[PDB]
Design a protein around this motif. Structure first.
Motif, PDB file in Angstrom:
ATOM      1  N   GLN A  12      17.952  10.670   1.053  1.00  0.00           N
ATOM      2  CA  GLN A  12      18.060  10.250   2.269  1.00  0.00           C
ATOM      3  C   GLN A  12      18.719   8.798   1.898  1.00  0.00           C
ATOM      4  O   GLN A  12      17.965   7.858   2.186  1.00  0.00           O
ATOM      5  CB  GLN A  12      16.768  10.291   2.893  1.00  0.00           C
ATOM      6  CG  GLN A  12      15.938  11.745   2.710  1.00  0.00           C
ATOM      7  CD  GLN A  12      16.576  12.568   3.103  1.00  0.00           C
ATOM      8  OE1 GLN A  12      17.676  12.908   3.413  1.00  0.00           O
ATOM      9  NE2 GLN A  12      15.588  13.926   3.051  1.00  0.00           N
ATOM     10  N   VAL A  13      20.121   8.783   1.962  1.00  0.00           N
ATOM     11  CA  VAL A  13      20.696   7.587   2.320  1.00  0.00           C
ATOM     12  C   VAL A  13      20.673   6.975   3.550  1.00  0.00           C
ATOM     13  O   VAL A  13      20.606   7.953   4.728  1.00  0.00           O
ATOM     14  CB  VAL A  13      22.232   7.805   1.672  1.00  0.00           C
ATOM     15  CG1 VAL A  13      22.330   8.055   0.125  1.00  0.00           C
ATOM     16  CG2 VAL A  13      22.633   8.834   2.414  1.00  0.00           C
ATOM     17  N   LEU A  14      20.775   5.722   3.690  1.00  0.00           N
ATOM     18  CA  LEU A  14      20.310   4.937   5.030  1.00  0.00           C
ATOM     19  C   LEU A  14      21.916   4.465   5.492  1.00  0.00           C
ATOM     20  O   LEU A  14      22.153   4.370   6.786  1.00  0.00           O
ATOM     21  CB  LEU A  14      19.527   4.060   4.723  1.00  0.00           C
ATOM     22  CG  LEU A  14      18.265   4.414   4.140  1.00  0.00           C
ATOM     23  CD1 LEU A  14      17.096   3.458   3.767  1.00  0.00           C
ATOM     24  CD2 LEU A  14      17.471   5.671   4.903  1.00  0.00           C
ATOM     25  N   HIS A  15      22.563   3.868   4.447  1.00  0.00           N
ATOM     26  CA  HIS A  15      23.821   3.146   5.248  1.00  0.00           C
ATOM     27  C   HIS A  15      24.673   4.082   5.814  1.00  0.00           C
ATOM     28  O   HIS A  15      24.999   5.178   5.293  1.00  0.00           O
ATOM     29  CB  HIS A  15      24.481   2.319   3.874  1.00  0.00           C
ATOM     30  CG  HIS A  15      25.435   1.292   4.504  1.00  0.00           C
ATOM     31  ND1 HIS A  15      26.603   1.374   4.913  1.00  0.00           N
ATOM     32  CD2 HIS A  15      25.297  -0.183   4.495  1.00  0.00           C
ATOM     33  CE1 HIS A  15      27.134   0.499   5.211  1.00  0.00           C
ATOM     34  NE2 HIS A  15      26.364  -0.569   5.102  1.00  0.00           N
TER      35      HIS A  15
END
Ligand code: ADP
Ligand code: ADP
Ligand code: ADP
Ligand code: MG
Ligand code: MG
Lengths: 52, 526, 105, 43, 260, 536, 49
Positions: A12-15
């Motif tokens: 789950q990448v955020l950027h």
């Protein structure tokens, strides 16, 4: 997994740019089904060049 | 952040090596030492405090062990083997625990000397085989038709309990109850003293008034006072169904549009009750016992025919009544037949004991079930007396099933030890040392008897060993009261062969099981 | 078969509001200053210290002897402080050149 | 959302609680919806 | 990870793609026509390409797990006591009505099973049903008495796939259950996966129309999932080759040429 | 933390590889002390005092609380080996962990993991081929003794090892009893059809092999007979209770006179059903559903047994063994409600037997088929459970030997011979695949090393002697019989295990090798771990 | 017997079986040799003067 799309989706990448890269890999998987790792690398290299 | 990473879950412990074996053996020894002093005719009782506020003042090993909560798994295994010994043969519970503890104690010595547990286990199994062979060899037959011999056997079984003061009465009660319960149908012999030899304890009175009844006895009164409380030769009908109007299984709704339907339906309910009562009455009985309720109208209809009714009797009590009086429990009274009517009871008497009504169906002719009425000082005394009576009945049924006997007072232990040592004298491998260790560890029973008696353990044990080294001395044991050597042919302390075989097998197998174990792991969930 | 595996405006410089609210500000400030005084008196020692044949004295026995036979009237009891403010104004008051010994128990 | 039990399909998607003829239902946060038209009819 | 098994998997994927499209007319490949079934156990070398249909549902029958010359029919109605869509109750006001109801229910179930059997069907697939009993114990007993292998709890979403595979037209009312609505097959049996489960395979069909199934097996779940993903990648590669008939070199050659 | 911006922890390269190898080594070391005849059992405490004294690797690995993914992989590998073979559950885990350790050691030397994986795959294939071509022994040259020897070998390290002379005979008899042929002429042996009942009491040597079936059930009523000589067993899959209408049926009464008739019918229906069942001549009635008191009375008056709440699998086995037919309903094809005598099973005796204050039904000598059941007697419940696990292992081993008629020598002979052969063969394939195959061969030696270590003997010297014997067998054509030499753990010297009777099924070794190789490859493919923080 | 713990400990630390060493020591001492102890530099239970 070695599949690029699966790797990108699982973590789950955020950027926001990372999320757009995940969507790009998903689109490559939909249209082609292979090369989901090469396309993300190409996009990253293109933006790295865009830096300079 | 950055939570710790580890292979096994948290709070998962693990111990391995000599430490685990030492801990298991020490736990077994501690369990044995708990009840070491409760063996022999001179044993002293222990008072246990039940978690629910009760008090268990007992001498039986199994009761003491099952009243104790432990954490070490080896202690759990020891309690389990005590329970299995109690369930299988009925006594020997405190002997098997001591034997297992001694066997593990003597195995620890070989474990400390670079001997693999597998060799010890093989030696233990060979020893157990030879122990069984010697026990079967030194056994003697018994004529079960001889009442005196059976009474003496039961006495030898109950000399170590608190009931030894009334030993004669206790032995007579146990023998009579066991012989009454004995049954055979369709070529299948059966002695079911768990379900057909019921012990009823009524506090008060004196223990000399306790007796076994030629029938059953329940804590029930007549449904209606007009019913007779004393019938000479009652014809008994047993039921397990309600004698009252009840709703059906299917969902049912009536619909009333005219005036008379309500009263008509109530009258049909009354008529159904009358029909059931008439169906019962057609067999001309004298008393009706059922497990479900009896309506007031049903009571009226039964009283009109001079029939006594007992309302709500438990299933087990009803089965005991059926066995005692020769009845047969039926569910639908319309299918009641003459054979189902129970004739054979010689008296129905509902008398008052203290401030409660008790129903007696005694005086039966050839009853296959019985009740043991116990009177005593208090509830704890009666509970201990009941435990002793259970031991006596179990021993009697063991003798009835297997008519072999072996000498008591530690004579069998020393005889088997000497035979095992003589056999080991021809062994040449490394297995001979644990073999002899088991043989000598068998001597813990006479040593415990001597210690409880208060005599000198070393001198008496040496004298007993020297006496057993002779030829015709397999019946020489120790007198547990006077602390002297005596031939068991004179003292008469003989015990069933089945009990000794079960004790020996359970002890050796528990030793093997605990020797097989290493690398304790704990803390995981389910 | 059957048998199988189954089985912006940051700079504010507020003008008059502080003047209007100084009443409540001082209302809270007096209690806060009392709390600081109490906790200062406590921290003066707590934490800071919470972190960490003539010799046979035959005379000790006779010291005990006349300490036992000390006086005639009632011996009184050790004063007990019941409130933290009691301890604070007990130590704050009283003559300065007189030693005060407190026993936490 | 209202789902068809037999076919296991979402009929129409439109709310702490709601209550209901299985055509008009009210949802509270009143919001009355009619399945024949798929629109809010009362408030 | 499945690269030592490429000699087994690559022809498998090529055949799977080629057997679901028309080589001379197709411009795209629908990968939903290639069902993938993952079963734990065995090794990746045990991966198999099944021409017919593979069902994970168990056979409700006992003692009938292998039918030769099968006649498979789909049932979308329920083999239980009659029940109308609108509210219905049966009112019993007399004692004879009780056993009349019992006998009539038995007769209804028996007539349903007899109508099903008269068409020659010996393998029956029953669609999953909610709010009504799809298969009744009486109906199951009657079907077993007539030697019909019954598989129930068939998902609705798989109806189209089953019809495309074995050529069976689904039936929703018993009045329309005829012989021509069935799908012939050479063999329909339940196989045992060496104690790892049971699979029902219907292999060999009169009209095997553009549908193939791939059974993926492995030692652990993770390797099975990754093997499925890799097989999907191979199928997608062949799909790309079908969409645009153009082949290029690999190993970084296009990228180097592009950069230069 | 960093430019990646992933909510979790990341480990890459040597760190994660070492973590995986550490987890695999931990799992291996958990069960390494329970291998071979000189192995020892374990106690497992289930946090509430529940004790499990076990030696089976699968049981230990399932009961443990495991968190690391590689450890879970090894645990499920043990479970798969147990499910698919039934034996060698500890050996497969040990071999997989050793393979992973040596592969990681190769990788640390900058050998690419792909080359290691290719070498491992080639070595596994070559090892299977060599086992199938050289180390297999056909059971036709041995006979019934081979089955007993295989069962005894499987019973070593178990609580029933010393009594193997008796337990192996019991196992072989049971397996041969449950045998029946099927279509296409392949005689297969349905294990798990041997009902195993555990009851504490007398010693292990008094365990009974029932020539029939054993039920953990008792007669419904005390008034029924507890022994029937010529049993006519009727198997039913429905309850015998008061008849109740379904949801769609309602009873609405407008005339009160019908209520009595309706209530009478509600029980007369079941009465008529039971009357038919008894009129056909049945003596024993077994049903999966319940039985009401009036039905029990009907059976009592008829002088017949009736057992309720019988397990479905037990009922199926009884019906198959006795020739009975399971009936979920009484409904013929004519719409009536009948019960003909053709659906009755037969047995030479059905007895209510008492076993340590507990009672159970024995169905002795069922006709039209033979069935077997085993009753185990032990000191307590833990010992009986371990006995059941060991018995299941032995039954599975005997089934494997009977289905596939090839066996291989035990006691480390196969591993030593394979190690020598693969070490020699690695020189003829590739350049770094040579190193991979050599490491595979050296990893295969962990089994004899663990066996020797468990016996507190010189593992190095014993393994060296075994390797010398096997190398001499492989290099000298006229000394080929030395390939049967294994390890004799009692004396700590090499011994011809084929002559000594130490046998194992070939399937155990082959499946263990394949599964361990695949698990090792799966773990070896990983070089990066992303551990997302839990959402809770 | 408590004196046996010294040769037993020596044999256990040396890595051999203590019982065999003690048996050999008793045999050789009964023979009449009182200057014989266990051989440390041996892989098997052995004794020497
Ligand atoms: N045997 C090979 N030799 C050289 N290059 C290869 C080989 N196999 C694949 N490649 C290259 O590796 C690149 C990555 O392919 P792959 O990892 O399978 O999918 P993705 O393109 O999604 O990463 C491809 O561009 C291909 O040209
Ligand atoms: N009068 C006696 N004299 C000597 N020994 C006795 C006497 N009575 C019983 N024993 C011995 O005591 C043992 C019975 O003790 P008991 O307390 O019943 O232990 P357990 O409950 O294990 O049977 C028997 O083995 C018997 O040999
Ligand atoms: N009598 C014996 N002598 C030598 N080796 C044996 C003997 N019995 C078994 N073995 C070996 O011990 C090894 C370990 O078996 P074990 O661990 O008990 O089975 P599992 O792996 O199913 O738990 C087996 O590979 C077998 O070859
Ligand atoms: Mg006793
Ligand atoms: Mg094994």
């Amino acid at each position: 997994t070695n599949d690029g799309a699966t790797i990108l989706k699982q973590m789950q990448v955020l950027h926001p740019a990372a999320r757009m890269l995940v969507e790009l890999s998903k689109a490559q998987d939909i249209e082609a089904g292979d090369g989901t790792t090469s396309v993300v690398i190409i996009a990253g290299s293109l933006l790295d060049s865009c830096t300079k | 952040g950055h939570r710790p990473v580890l292979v096994l879950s948290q709070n998962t412990k693990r111990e391995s090596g000599r430490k685990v074996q030492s801990g298991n053996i020490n736990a077994a020894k501690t369990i044995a030492d708990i009840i070491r002093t409760c063996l022999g005719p001179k044993s002293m009782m222990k008072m246990l405090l039940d978690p629910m506020g009760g008090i268990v003042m007992t001498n039986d090993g199994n009761a003491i062990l099952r009243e104790i909560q432990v954490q070490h798994p080896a202690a759990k295994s020891m309690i389990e083997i005590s329970r299995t010994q109690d369930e299988e043969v009925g006594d020997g519970t405190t002997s098997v625990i001591i034997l297992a503890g001694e066997m593990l104690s003597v195995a620890e010595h070989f474990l400390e000397q670079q001997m693999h547990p597998t060799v010890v286990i093989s030696a233990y199994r060979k020893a157990l085989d030879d122990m069984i062979s010697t026990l079967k060899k030194i056994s003697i037959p018994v004529d079960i038709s001889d009442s005196d011999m059976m009474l003496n056997i039961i006495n030898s079984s109950i000399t170590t309990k608190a009931i030894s003061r009334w030993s004669s009465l206790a032995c007579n009660i146990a023998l009579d109850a066991v012989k009454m319960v004995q049954f055979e149908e369709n070529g299948r012999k059966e002695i079911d003293i768990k379900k057909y030899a019921r012990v009823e304890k009524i506090p008060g009175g004196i223990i000399e008034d306790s007796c076994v009844l030629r029938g059953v006895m329940i804590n029930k009164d007549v449904t209606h006072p007009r019913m007779r409380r004393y019938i000479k030769n009652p014809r008994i009908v047993l039921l397990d169904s309600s004698l009252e109007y009840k709703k059906g299984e299917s969902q049912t709704d009536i619909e009333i549009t005219r005036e008379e339907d309500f009263t008509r339906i109530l009258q049909m309910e009354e008529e159904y009750i009358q029909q059931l009562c008439e169906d019962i009455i057609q067999l001309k009985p004298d008393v009706v016992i059922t497990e479900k309720g009896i309506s007031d109208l049903a009571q009226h209809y039964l009283m009109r025919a001079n029939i006594t009714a007992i309302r709500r009797v438990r299933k087990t009590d009803n089965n005991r009544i059926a066995r005692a009086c020769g009845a047969r429990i039926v569910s639908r009274p319309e299918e009641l037949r003459e054979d189902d009517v129970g004739t054979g009871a010689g008296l129905l008497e509902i008398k008052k004991i203290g401030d409660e009504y008790f129903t007696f169906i005694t005086d039966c002719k050839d009853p296959k079930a019985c009740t043991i009425l116990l009177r005593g000082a208090s509830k704890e005394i009666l509970s201990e007396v009941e435990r002793n009576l259970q031991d006596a009945m179990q021993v009697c049924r063991n003798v009835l099933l297997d008519p072999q006997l072996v000498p008591g007072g530690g004579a069998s232990e020393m005889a088997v030890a000497h035979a095992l040592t003589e056999k080991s004298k021809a062994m040449t491998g490394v297995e001979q040392w644990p073999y002899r260790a088991v043989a000598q560890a068998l001597e813990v029973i006479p040593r415990t008897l001597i210690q409880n008696c208060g005599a000198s353990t070393i001198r008496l044990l040496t004298s007993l060993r020297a006496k057993h080294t002779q030829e015709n001395c397999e019946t020489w044991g120790v007198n547990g009261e006077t602390g002297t050597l005596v031939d068991m042919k004179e003292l008469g302390i003989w015990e069933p062969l089945a009990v000794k075989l079960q004790t020996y097998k359970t002890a050796v197998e528990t030793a093997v099981l605990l020797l097989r174990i290493d690398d304790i792991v704990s803390g995981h969930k389910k | 078969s059957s048998s199988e595996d189954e089985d912006a405006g940051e700079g504010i410089s507020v003008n008059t509001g502080p003047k209007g609210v100084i009443n409540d500000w001082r209302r809270f400030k007096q209690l806060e200053t009392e709390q600081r005084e109490e906790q200062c008196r406590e921290m003066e020692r707590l934490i800071k210290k919470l972190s960490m044949f003539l010799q046979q004295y035959r005379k000790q026995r006779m010291e005990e002897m006349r300490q036992q036979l000390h006086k005639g009237p009632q011996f009184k009891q050790v004063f007990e402080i019941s409130s933290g403010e009691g301890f604070l104004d007990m130590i704050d008051k009283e003559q300065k050149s007189i030693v005060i010994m407190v026993h936490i128990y | 959302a209202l789902w068809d039990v037999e076919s296991g399909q979402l009929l129409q998607s439109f709310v702490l609680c709601l209550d209901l003829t299985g055509n008009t239902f009210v949802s509270g946060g009143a919001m009355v919806w009619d399945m024949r038209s798929g629109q809010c009819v009362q408030a | 990870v499945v690269s030592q098994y490429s000699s087994l998997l690559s022809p498998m994927s090529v055949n799977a793609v080629m057997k679901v499209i028309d080589p001379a007319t197709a411009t795209s490949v629908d990968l939903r026509d290639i069902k993938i079934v993952k079963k734990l156990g065995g090794t990746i070398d045990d991966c198999e390409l099944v021409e017919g249909l593979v069902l994970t549902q168990k056979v409700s029958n006992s003692g009938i797990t292998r039918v030769e010359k099968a006649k498979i029919g789909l049932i979308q109605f329920c083999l239980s006591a009659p029940k109308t869509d609108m509210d219905n109750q049966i009112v019993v006001s007399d004692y004879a009505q009780m056993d009349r109801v019992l006998r009539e229910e038995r007769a209804y179930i028996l007539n349903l099973v007899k109508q099903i059997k008269k068409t020659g069907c010996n393998v029956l697939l029953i669609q999953k049903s909610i709010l009504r009993d799809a298969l009744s114990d009486l109906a199951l007993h009657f079907l077993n008495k007539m030697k019909i292998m019954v598989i129930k709890d068939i998902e609705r979403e798989d109806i189209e796939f089953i019809c495309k595979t074995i050529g069976t037209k689904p039936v929703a009312h018993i009045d329309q259950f005829t012989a021509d609505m069935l799908g012939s097959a050479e063999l329909a049996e339940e196989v045992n996966l060496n104690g790892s489960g049971k699979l029902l395979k219907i292999t060999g069909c009169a009209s095997p129309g553009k549908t193939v199934t791939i059974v993926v097996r492995g030692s652990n779940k993770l390797v099975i999932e990754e093997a499925e993903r890799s097989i999907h990648d191979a199928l997608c590669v062949i799909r790309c080759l079908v969409k645009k008939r153009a082949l290029i070199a690999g190993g970084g050659a296009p990228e180097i040429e592009l950069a230069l | 933390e960093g430019p990646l911006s992933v909510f979790g922890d990341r480990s890459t390269g040597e760190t994660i590889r070492s973590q995986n190898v550490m987890a695999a080594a931990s799992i291996a070391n958990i069960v390494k002390s329970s291998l071979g005849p000189v192995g020892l059992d374990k106690m497992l405490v289930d946090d509430i005092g529940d004790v499990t004294i076990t030696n089976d690797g699968a049981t230990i690995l399932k009961l443990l609380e495991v968190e690391h993914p590689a450890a879970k992989v090894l645990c499920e590998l043990a479970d798969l080996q147990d499910k698919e073979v039934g034996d060698g559950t500890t050996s497969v885990v040990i071999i997989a962990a050793e393979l992973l350790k040596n592969a990681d050691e190769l990788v640390k030397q900058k050998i690419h993991p792909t080359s290691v994986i290719s070498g491992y795959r080639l070595a596994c294939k070559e090892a299977v081929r060599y086992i199938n071509e050289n180390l297999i022994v056909n059971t036709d040259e041995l006979g019934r003794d081979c089955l007993i020897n295989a069962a005894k070998t499987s019973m070593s390290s178990k609580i029933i090892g010393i009594n193997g002379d008796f337990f192996a005979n019991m196992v072989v008899d049971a397996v041969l009893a449950i045998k029946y042929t099927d279509i296409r002429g392949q005689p297969r042996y349905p294990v798990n059809s041997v009902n195993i009942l555990k009851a504490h009491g007398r010693s292990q040597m008094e365990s009974m092999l029932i020539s029939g079936y054993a039920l953990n059930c008792v007669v419904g009523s005390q008034g029924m007979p507890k022994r029937i000589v010529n049993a006519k067993i009727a198997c039913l899959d429905f309850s015998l209770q008061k008849t109740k209408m379904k949801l769609g049926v309602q009873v609405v009464i407008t005339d009160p006179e019908k209520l009595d008739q309706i209530r009478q019918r509600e029980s007369d229906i079941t009465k008529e059903r039971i009357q038919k069942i008894l009129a056909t001549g049945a003596n024993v009635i077994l049903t999966t559903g319940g039985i009401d008191d009036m039905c029990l009375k009907y059976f009592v008056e008829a002088g017949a047994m009736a057992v309720r709440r019988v397990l479905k699998r037990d009922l199926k086995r009884i019906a198959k063994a006795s020739g009975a037919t399971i009936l979920s309903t009484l409904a013929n094809l004519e719409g009536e409600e009948t019960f003909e005598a053709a659906m009755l099973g037969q047995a030479e005796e059905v007895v209510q037997e008492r076993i340590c204050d507990d009672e159970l039904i024995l169905i002795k000598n069922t006709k039209a088929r033979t069935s077997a059941s085993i009753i185990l007697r032990g000191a307590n419940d833990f010992m009986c459970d371990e006995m059941e696990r060991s018995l299941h292992d032995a039954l599975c081993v005997v089934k494997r030997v009977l289905e596939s008629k090839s066996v291989v020598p035990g006691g480390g002979a196969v591993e030593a011979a394979l190690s020598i052969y693969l070490e020699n063969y690695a020189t003829s394939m590739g350049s770094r695949e040579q190193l991979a195959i050599a490491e595979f061969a050296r990893s295969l030696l962990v089994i004899p090393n663990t066996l020797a270590v468990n016996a507190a003997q010189d593992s190095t010297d014993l393994v060296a002697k075994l390797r010398a014997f096997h190398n001499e067998a492989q290099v000298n054509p006229e000394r080929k019989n030395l390939k049967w030499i294994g390890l004799d753990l009692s004396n700590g010297k090499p011994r011809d295990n084929k002559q000594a009777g130490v046998f194992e099924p070939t399937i155990v070794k082959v499946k263990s090798l394949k599964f361990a190789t695949e698990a090792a490859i799966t773990i070896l493919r990983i070089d990066d771990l992303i551990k997302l923080h839990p959402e809770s | 017997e408590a004196f046996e713990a010294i040769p037993r400990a020596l044999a256990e630390n040396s890595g051999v079986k203590a019982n065999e060493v003690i048996s050999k020591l008793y045999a050789v001492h009964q023979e009449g040799n009182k200057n014989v102890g266990l051989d440390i530099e041996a892989e098997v239970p052995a004794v020497k003067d």
